[PDB]
């Protein structure tokens, strides 16, 4: 997979949040999970997993606003500057260093998607209950839904236009048909609920 863009350096590249630029090519939206490869000087690789939430464009090369805006259409040296922000989810190793500005950033779609959504921690019970923009199901920890680790479900939103009751039926349909209960039942070892 070709890299969408490159990490900017003019803005701060603090490990918590870092800006990056996108080269002419694949578009970048909002709430899309991406991963960047970082090479430490010693030699150990580091990967940062995060999701974008703020995107923007800026017309560079023009100084006086709306005076040469029509001139650019006819004849003027001008271009665009497409960039976006990344909020990191978690780091593949356990350390906090800023990514080196000048390294490529690429989307996560295979295994790298799994570590982004903490699919390794929740492996045996990976209950799908949603789909992202692309064809990748979203895993839900069934251990939190049931009493194995505790938790409930709370759907909130504006009444009417927001389809609230549709999600409860969809989760009920997915739980009772994906075989999640059957999988968790195995390896009981005399558990309290093994049916």
């Amino acid at each position: 997979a070709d890299a969408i863009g490159m990490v900017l350096g003019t803005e701060d590249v603090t490990p918590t949040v870092f800006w990056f630029a996108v080269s002419h090519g694949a578009s970048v939206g909002l709430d899309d999970l991406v991963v960047v490869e970082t090479r430490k000087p010693d030699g150990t690789p580091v990967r940062f997993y995060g999701l974008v939430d703020n995107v923007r464009k800026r017309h560079e090369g023009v100084t006086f606003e709306s005076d040469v805006e029509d001139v650019v259409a006819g004849l003027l040296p001008a271009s665009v500057s497409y960039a976006a922000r990344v909020l990191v989810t978690r780091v593949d190793p356990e350390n906090f260093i800023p990514p080196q500005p000048g390294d490529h950033v690429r989307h996560a779609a295979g295994r790298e998607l799994a570590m982004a959504l903490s699919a390794d921690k929740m492996e045996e019970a990976a209950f799908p209950g949603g789909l992202l923009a692309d064809g990748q199901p979203l895993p839900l920890n069934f251990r939190f839904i049931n009493g194995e680790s505790g938790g409930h479900i709370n759907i909130s939103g504006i009444s009417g236009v927001a389809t609230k009751t549709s999600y409860a039926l969809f989760l009920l349909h997915s739980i009772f048909r994906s075989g999640v209960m059957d999988r968790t039942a195995q390896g009981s070892g005399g558990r309290q609920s093994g049916t």
């Binding site: 560079e60 090369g61 004849l75 040296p77 001008a78 271009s79 000048g102």
Partner: protein
């Protein structure tokens, strides 16, 4: 009935006028460029500075002029293939003192706590040229040692096909008289030798970007220093290269750069040796052509030299503090 603006740059030289450099053997053969495998290409530049002008008299009754000017040279290393980014090989800070025939002494400096400076001696022409006593020599000295510095990293010269240039170098402006043996390439920017003829201009404006004009022979006579008496008459090889198609409003002659290549008289070996460079320059400068929108001088510039020249300004300190330091030294 056609008028347009043509990009040009001139700060130091005066009364350059517009001349005709045409000597012999101009031909019209537009040939496309092909990239070649070379390890590294070096682009060098220099920058002069003026700290403070001086004026002293020492029991003579006649004034003399001096200056505390500074000059810094630097080089940038590029890989044409594009494996990694560029790197600044070296940037060294140097200063000069240009005083008339008065012979000052004590070239020592002591930093009280904060500031440091270099003090030395030099001889501009041993009435006298007052205002220009340090505006023309300091640039002359700056290019003198810059060529000497560039002469150390140089690819081995080849007779006809002995060896390809391992480390190419590139110099600003015309090639100087000092460099005669090193494998160097210079690029000029002045447009005072543009109009070759009625037909030559017609083909020059109509050539597509990326190709180079055929190599022509120049006798480098008129531009040579008067009464130089170095060896007599030299020979140079020149060819034009286009970087862009030029903006619609700009003159069609924009985006055309002329290069120099010093060669021995009727050698007949160097022309076969620099034939690869003629094809190499077709695509090397196309990548090195500065894209228009960022810089005020949209054509007629290079990406590394724009960042390089700003680097020299950082190598020397701010103009205010150095002036404050020399002011304290003068009274004491």
């Amino acid at each position: 009935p056609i008028d347009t603006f043509e990009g040009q740059l001139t700060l130091k030289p005066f009364a350059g006028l517009v001349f005709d450099v045409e000597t012999d053997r101009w031909e019209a053969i537009p040939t496309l460029g092909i990239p070649e495998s070379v390890r590294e290409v070096l682009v060098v530049d220099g920058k002069p500075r003026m700290e403070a002008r001086l004026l002293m008299d020492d029991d003579s009754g006649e004034l003399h002029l001096a200056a505390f000017g500074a000059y810094v040279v630097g080089a940038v290393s590029l890989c044409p293939h594009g494996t990694r980014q560029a790197e600044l090989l070296d940037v060294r800070a140097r200063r000069v003192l240009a005083y008339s025939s008065d012979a000052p002494l004590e070239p020592a400096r002591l930093s009280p706590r904060n500031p440091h400076t270099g003090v030395l001696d030099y001889e501009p022409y041993a009435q006298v040229e007052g205002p220009r006593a340090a505006v023309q020599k300091l640039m002359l000295q700056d290019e003198q040692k810059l060529s000497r510095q560039l002469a150390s990293p140089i690819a081995l010269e080849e007779g006809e096909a002995d060896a390809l240039p391992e480390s190419l170098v590139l110099q600003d402006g015309p090639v100087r008289l000092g460099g005669g043996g090193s494998a160097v390439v210079g690029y000029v920017k002045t447009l005072h030798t543009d109009y070759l003829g009625a037909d030559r201009i017609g083909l020059l404006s109509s050539l597509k970007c990326g190709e180079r004009t055929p190599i022509l022979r120049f006798r480098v006579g008129d531009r040579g220093g008067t009464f130089s008496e170095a060896e007599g008459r030299e020979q140079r090889f020149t060819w034009y290269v286009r970087l862009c198609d030029a903006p619609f409003y700009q003159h069609p002659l924009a985006g055309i750069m002329r290069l120099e290549m010093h060669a021995p008289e009727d050698s007949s070996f160097v022309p076969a040796a620099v034939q690869q460079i003629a094809d190499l320059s077709g695509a090397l400068l196309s990548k090195l052509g500065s894209k228009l929108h960022k810089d005020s001088r949209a054509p007629q510039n290079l990406i590394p030299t724009a960042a390089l020249e700003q680097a020299m300004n950082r190598s020397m300190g701010n103009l205010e503090l150095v002036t404050r330091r020399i002011r304290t030294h003068l009274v004491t």
